[PDB]
Amino acid sequence: SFSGYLKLTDNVYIKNADIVEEAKKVKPTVVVNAANVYLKHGGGVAGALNKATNNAMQVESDDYIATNGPLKVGGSCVLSGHNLAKHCLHVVGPNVNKGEDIQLLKSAYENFNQHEVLLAPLLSAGIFGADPIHSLRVCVDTVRTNVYLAVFDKNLYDKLVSSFL
């Protein structure tokens, strides 16, 4: 199963890991993607997960958008996890760099509650521009299901654990 995670709460665990490498090792039921509303997986977690699927995630995502239109900020959709997981839960956290409402971060984390266990990144962190300390706080106060957080940056991982209340 998952190994080397530090327990933060009853249901939230954290590890300094590349989520792509974690997904290929564990092959979880659900891997969360830090998606945008158009499912255009260019950079950050989305670009790395899509690259690991040899672009199959992008092709499937384009068909989903052609059929359904864009997601909402705070929303999600379940698609295939390809070679990384059984499913990929594409969740859209607010992108602060695009001036989106940070209050939608709690709504984005609520999508995790529909899945018993997930491998996930910190929503709205990284290139999405939100404070990762705040994202971890919203995660532990919103998600009730088992979430295994993979934090790519070692220095940020150390800061998140050492500042966790």
What span, in angstroms and rounded, lies between the C-alpha atoms of 60 and 39? 10
Evaluate whether 64 touches 71 at the Cβ level (below 8 Å).
no
Length of the chain measured in residues: 165
Q: How many CA atoms lie within 13 A of 86 on its CB side?
A: 6
Q: How far, in Å, CA of 158 to CA of 162, rounded?
A: 6
Q: Can you tell me the distance from the alpha carbon of 84 to that of 139, in angstroms, rounded to the nearest whole number?
A: 23
Contact 105, 93 (CB under 8 A): yes
Integer-rounded Cα radius of gyration of the chain? 14
Give 60-65's long-range contacts (Cβ < 8 A, gap of 24+): 61/90, 64/39, 65/38, 65/39
SS3 content of the chain, % helix, strand, coil (to 5): 40, 20, 40
Other Cβ atoms closer than 10 A to 98 = 11
CA–CA distance, 163 with 140 (Å, rounded to integer): 14
- Quick one: tokens of 92? 């859209």
Whole-number Å distance between alpha carbons of 37 and 49: 16
Experimentally, how was this structure solved? X-ray
> Residue 116 is part of which domain span?
1-165
Overall number of domains in the chain: 1
Q: How far apart are CA 19 and CA 66, in angstroms?
A: 28
Which amino acid is it at 146? N
**Residues 85 and 20 sit within 8 Å (Cβ to Cβ):** no
